[PDB]
Write a protein that binds this DNA or RNA. Structure first.
Ligand SMILES: [Cl-]
Ligand SMILES: [Cl-]
Ligand SMILES: [Cl-]
Ligand SMILES: [Cl-]
Ligand SMILES: [Mn+2]
Ligand SMILES: [Mn+2]
Ligand SMILES: [Mn+2]
Ligand SMILES: [Mn+2]
Ligand SMILES: [Mn+2]
Ligand SMILES: [Mn+2]
Ligand SMILES: [Mn+2]
Ligand SMILES: [Mn+2]
Ligand SMILES: [Mn+2]
Ligand SMILES: [Mn+2]
Lengths: 85, 94, 99, 108, 97, 77, 104, 92
DNA sequence: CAATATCCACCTGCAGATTCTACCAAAAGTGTATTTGGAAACTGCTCCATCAAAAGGCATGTTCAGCTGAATTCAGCTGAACATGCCTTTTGATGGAGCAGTTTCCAAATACACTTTTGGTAGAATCTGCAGGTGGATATTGAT
DNA sequence: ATCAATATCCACCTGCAGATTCTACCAAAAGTGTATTTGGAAACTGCTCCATCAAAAGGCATGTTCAGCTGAATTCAGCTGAACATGCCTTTTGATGGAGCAGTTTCCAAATACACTTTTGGTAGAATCTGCAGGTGGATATTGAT
């Protein structure tokens, strides 16, 4: 990846988070929601991935395939349609 | 070289029966394919357990039927169970 | 006037807009990096099958848009119309995600 | 030998009764798979497929579209109490959510 | 005479019932509710004794769980009394409704 | 018959769940949920009975039902 | 000469191997599979027991019963997570009250 | 003719707390547990080896599976314990 | 401060329940044989990882005024705390037997091992639903 | 109560990416003959499960008060939502290597098969006990007031 990947969570701009909450139905948003979103988000991701990569290591590959994620999400209880079938 | 399966071909046949002149996108068929599979697995697995539970070693239609009943919600089940029991007799009638 | 909409008018406006559509609401690239960063931390030198990054983002956003609803109902449940961490924290708890 | 006719065609199904039977065996669900199982399961699967398709086809009809897309499938499911519940912990790509604004939020 | 201020005994009851692990619903009536309910599924049914035990352990445990989440919802809305409303918010969020 | 669940009981429970002050409409609301719970878990339970071609709902019948319900229960099978 | 005495465990290594075969999991089962598993089962059991012990004793009691398990469980973050959706028959709940409910 | 882990759980209850006993129900609880966890670990493994076009569930699967069902520290010891115990099997 | 009730360690006892102790149909374990993954190793062949411009969508800041959220009184009812008043749950066993479970057999199923016929999947042509784009109407909104 | 000042709508258009159509090769479903193995008929069988019947305190069901709780209704500082500037940074293309990914040979290390032998693990019966089940007696909070 060359340039060291750092502080990319703050790459979930405030406008974007606000957008997600609009599609969510939220009308007004406290100023402290944003960082709170990154916190929840980051954990969600670390998990789906952590399991995904486990699947990748089990298959002995250097690539994380769409299925690896689809399986990760399934066991996480967040089943997703549109990539693994 | 590398043969990928799916239900796309069948999903389609069905689409044309309900909506003769309607089409379905790639992403849409994607969703649909996942669906048949989530449900295929859901029922098969449910039947599987039903058999182990009954110390029996084979999955009959009967098992698949309680699976569907345990799995599917209300009206969907009725219809599924009927449609299901139907096709089999129509089948066993050689 | 210069013209000016009252506080909330555009808010309710956006909601209607973003509920009528289906595009992801986060910028692809940043997401790209955030994932690679996080994944870089579990197992070094991992290659990502594009669609995989695409699936994670579809799952992430779908997830939040969902947390935001339960969040919103917690704000309304307490006579408020403005979601606060307080709310997100209660939905998460009740959901079991953290208790 | 009599000219073959797919088990499916016998059951008057559009779903591959042969492909389901295989998947049942190569799936490990049981030590052995019956003979009508794949016919029954295929029947249930084909059933459900058509149901989604029905509601979806309309969802597209409404929006003035001849071609179905995920949006329409999200719309079908989330609006039909049942399909909604069957696929309640299921997230559908590029589908969005149902349009819905809490009433307390609205203006005077 | 002597009378405990309201809420002080409630606490007594909480501290008490949380400490114990015995069931709280009277068994006999439970069993009837069950038997009766089962009837809408199959007539002349036989309930393996323990299956009734199981059923209750299952229920009471479910309810107490709900009550906690409910309490959280009541507290969240600045209260201290559980209202059917908190029971709904809790369930609506659990995914049950 | 659901009234079989006396107002007291519903309180003994709430208390174990840490409830202090209880509304009065709650008791009703609580018999509502409860009723649904058993129905859903017994509806599934009896199916395992009936598939097992039996006339007796066994402790395991509940155990399995409860599992698919997502209420796993240790102590009966 | 018991496969278990070889892996140096207590749980039934052979049995676990049988249960796998007759479980409809895969076509065939590796030789060290029931081994690896039974020791995981061995592990997780001891782990819990150890904690229920303390719990049991902490009440001047010697025989471990439900309430003690429900204690070693919900008090431990990892076990509570792992058994995150399991209800322990006749186990009770943890002594806990929302400070927002305590007296004046 | 009625199996359980009642025996083993106990022998184990004796390694850590030799001078301690266990109820009947408590002993019941302990069974449900082993069976439950047995069930989960087997299923993931099964799925794992199934996702990878493998027709045999091995130790490698049972391991990944563990590394999927158990929490951080819990997962670590399981794996050690599992690896340990296994290496010994092979080694005569 | 002290009167009330509520509680918590300090104590002995029998027995409803552990624990061992004593033997046996079932698996575990032991070869010897049989069949089979799936772990090596090479090769194309895809996707994946950058990179290099162009712009122009959008973030990031910076006001500025609207009304939320948080604070604060009041008191009209909820529901807790406390007694009376019985009505049922809750033990205690006993029959009577509807019933889950066990075997014997075996016709009717599914297993297999080849040998034959297709019903699909992968690509390569032809299309043909719409994303954009633009522009006249309604349809709101929010000052005067 | 009217007028701007903006969205919010809907109808046309029109090339092209994405959808059908149009073919050719094969892993796969069938179509056969054999192979083996379910699980039901029925014939019994202790095992609980379902009734009654008879008791007793042990809860459960009403009434009394009113202690604070839950809801209104005001306020007001101050936290956003709503608008522009400003000019980063994310698209959008679209060429290019090359890690890997997946096929495409085989080749042992292993797993499965069946056939006997050896031991458990489990199911009642024999000795033990860990804890209820009451009983006290200091304390331990509650709570009403010079
Ligand atoms: Cl069948
Ligand atoms: Cl907060
Ligand atoms: Cl309410
Ligand atoms: Cl192995
Ligand atoms: Mn139609
Ligand atoms: Mn091979
Ligand atoms: Mn307000
Ligand atoms: Mn053809
Ligand atoms: Mn358009
Ligand atoms: Mn007053
Ligand atoms: Mn290479
Ligand atoms: Mn052999
Ligand atoms: Mn022994
Ligand atoms: Mn005592």
């Amino acid at each position: 990846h060359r340039k060291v990947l750092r502080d990319n969570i703050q790459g979930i701009t405030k406008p974007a988070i606000r957008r997600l909450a609009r599609r969510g139905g939220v009308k007004r948003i406290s100023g402290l929601i944003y960082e709170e979103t990154r916190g929840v988000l980051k954990v969600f991701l670390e998990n789906v991935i952590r399991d995904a990569v486990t699947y990748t290591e089990h298959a002995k590959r250097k690539t994380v395939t769409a299925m690896d994620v689809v399986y990760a999400l399934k066991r996480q209880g967040r089943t997703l349609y549109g990539f693994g079938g | 070289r590398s043969r990928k399966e799916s239900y796309s071909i069948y999903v389609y046949k069905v689409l044309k029966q309900v909506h003769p002149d309607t089409g379905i996108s790639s992403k849409a068929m994607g969703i649909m394919n996942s669906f048949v599979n989530d449900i295929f697995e859901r029922i098969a697995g449910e039947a599987s357990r039903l058999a182990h539970y009954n110390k029996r070693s084979t999955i009959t239609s009967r098992e698949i039927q309680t699976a569907v009943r345990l799995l599917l919600p209300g009206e969907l089940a009725k219809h599924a169970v009927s449609e299901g029991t139907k096709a089999v007799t129509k089948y066993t009638s050689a | 006037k210069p013209h000016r909409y009252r506080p909330g008018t555009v808010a309710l406006r956006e909601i209607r807009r973003y509920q009528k559509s289906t595009e992801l609401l986060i910028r692809q690239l940043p997401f790209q990096r955030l994932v690679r960063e996080i994944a870089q931390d579990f197992k070094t030198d991992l290659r990502f099958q594009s669609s995989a990054v695409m699936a994670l983002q579809e799952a992430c956003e779908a997830y939040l848009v969902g947390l935001f609803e339960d969040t919103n109902l917690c704000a309304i449940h307490a006579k408020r119309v403005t979601i606060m961490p307080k709310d997100i924290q209660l939905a998460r708890r009740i959901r079991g995600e953290r208790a | 030998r009599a000219k073959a006719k797919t088990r499916s065609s016998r059951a008057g199904l559009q779903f591959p009764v042969g492909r389901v039977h295989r998947l049942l065996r190569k799936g490990n669900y049981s030590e052995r798979v019956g003979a009508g199982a794949p016919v029954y399961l295929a029947a249930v699967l084909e059933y459900l497929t058509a149901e989604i398709l029905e509601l979806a086809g309309n969802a597209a009809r409404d929006n003035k579209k001849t071609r179905i897309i995920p949006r329409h499938l999200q719309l079908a499911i989330r609006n039909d109490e049942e399909l909604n519940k069957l696929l309640g912990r299921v997230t559908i790509a590029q589908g969005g959510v149902l349009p819905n604004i809490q009433a307390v939020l609205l203006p005077k």
